[model samples]
Target chain A: IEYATRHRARSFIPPEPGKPYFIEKGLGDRAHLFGDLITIYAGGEQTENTFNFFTCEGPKGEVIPAHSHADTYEVFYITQGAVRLFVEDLEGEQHEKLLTPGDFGFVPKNCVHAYRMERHHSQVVGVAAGPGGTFERFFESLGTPAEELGLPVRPFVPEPEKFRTVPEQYDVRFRPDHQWHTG
Target chain B: IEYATRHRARSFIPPEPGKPYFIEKGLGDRAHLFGDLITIYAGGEQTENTFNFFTCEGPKGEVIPAHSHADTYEVFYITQGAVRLFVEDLEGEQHEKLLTPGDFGFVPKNCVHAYRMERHHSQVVGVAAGPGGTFERFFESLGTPAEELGLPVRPFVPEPEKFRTVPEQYDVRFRPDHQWHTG
Candidate 1:
């Protein structure tokens, strides 16, 4: 009870309490954002607020803007293809890790990070740790409901100049400048 | 930050805080238990008590006993092969979900749950939600360290009688008898 009380599981709310559930690939709430398809398997409706789990699928060469979260702890699991993840360290150097299938990455709170989807059908599992599902909510706000499980038909082309400020409440901060090296 | 203060991240500590890291496939603390290989990627060391994530790889035809957790919420993601997960509902009825690659399953606290690994090289990603990694710790205590990444050569065969009580402190309670149906 003490453990349950401490979490105040506001974010990990399940659709039904004390009930188990299952989700298969190409299922759940699929949202399309900037040419990327993100499917929410376990977010607010299932997380009870303790955690949020989702997946991202995109074509090769799509780069996510460099950003950082105020309080959200994030992780990435490369399910298919490859991904280049840039995570800022304490020394302020951005370390780029090229992740292939079954690789994992970790980003603690306030760490500047970004990613580039590599290879066709590149998919990654994203997990946001407790008390904050900042990216999950933010993605929901920006993403249009996607009907196709595959890549978006009307792919939104992103240009460096078109990158505008997102809603501040999401707690995702855009880092002005950062350099990444390729291995 | 208020967000960081609320939960008191006792379980989610990282090897190095505020620094991002990466782990490749088959590279982690491998623990073998009853013919199953569980690799610890993140637990108290990474979760900060917020959550624990790990992986399980086992051969086909292995059935895990049905059990329940008092407060630990758990999720399972099948990476390869197939898994038959039985999760007990509120009414004490068990519902089995046959999961395949890219499939996911959720078992909330107190929901009697168990699983059977159903294929060669069957691997699963397991996440234990906040304030508890009860099963992670229990598996750690019982698991013997392994140097090889493949299936255990000396597979520990399980019998109903040998399933003597697990230490009570682990918070995993075994249900004397529970039925499961095959897909």
Candidate 2:
């Protein structure tokens, strides 16, 4: 039996007159329930911290572009699914490892790598820790604008050159003044 | 049913030659699994950049001694049990919020707060974003070691100052070289 939900967030309305936005999308494609593919409980639009729980069902014969994080540390947990990850070591040797359910992976800042959805519906939940939606910048540099990168579709990957340094994707992002004061 | 395990790493043989220290207390302790909790399979520890997953079981009473971090962020998801978190706002007002399963909370650096299991055995699975291990220096400052603080039974709180500022307790005892480097 298939176990999943199709929950989606209601249209986001900014509290103030600003560009703030938040969206939630679950896995699967059920309209009544949240889709189980990805459930993003946005901290808030201008939130420097981004929290998301992802359960992906990759399309067959799909290849995620090779990319890297300019600043964020990306972590993935395989709750249920199987796939191969393509990562290059310092020696320039690219390694492909098959990951089954319960496998975990981490890509430190500025590391170049990519992932291929092994099966048509491989599910994984990931958490992108951030002070400024670093992962958001990652997807932004890929040419996928933040506002357009919400729901069902996979987040875009930026070109290789974007990872050379801290990309501008994260630029212009505003954080709450309270956060800075506390820090 | 309850399901949580505490993996203990100790310094056995008190300075065993080349290895210097060995770990003991590696048995599975269902200390965290005794309450109603949903099991969210995160992934194996070996997976790249992967962390563990388990939902939050709100605390019954209070978790204790308010604290904060200098680096790293903590994320909690409530799977079962009631959780009451004490957060101090910039104005210095202590706000207490109760959360049930499906609720998420973030404790950013320098945020003074505490949480408790609302039931007899509240289970909560948490993820720490950095390798630093939640204010290691702060806990060491307490003058009591983590292992000695609880055993036979892991006391949630004793209303003592020691329970508060555990991070400080540990921090004072740690040396510069004690800093951890991810593998």
Q: Per-candidate TM vs. native?
A: 0.84, 0.48
Measured by lDDT, the strongest candidate is: 1
**For model 2, what is the alpha-carbon lDDT of residue A172?**
25
Total clashes in model 1, counting residue pairs 3 or more apart in sequence or in different chains: 16
Candidate 1, fnat value? 0.70
For residue B177, model 2's alpha carbon misses the true position, in angstroms, by: 35
Per-residue CA lDDT of model 1 for B99-125, tens digit only, reads: 998888888778888899888889998
B68: Cα error in model 2, Å: 4.3
Candidate 2 C-alpha error for residue A78, in Å:
3.2
- Chain A TM-score values for every predicted structure, listed in order: 0.80, 0.53
The local lDDT score (0 to 100) that residue B15 gets in candidate 2 is 19
Identify the candidate with maximal TM-score. Answer: 1
RMSD for each of the candidates: 7.2, 13.7
lDDT, candidate 2, B159-182, per-residue tens: 346544554433222122221121
Interface RMSD, every prediction, one decimal place: 1.6, 10.0
lDDT of 1 at A108: 79
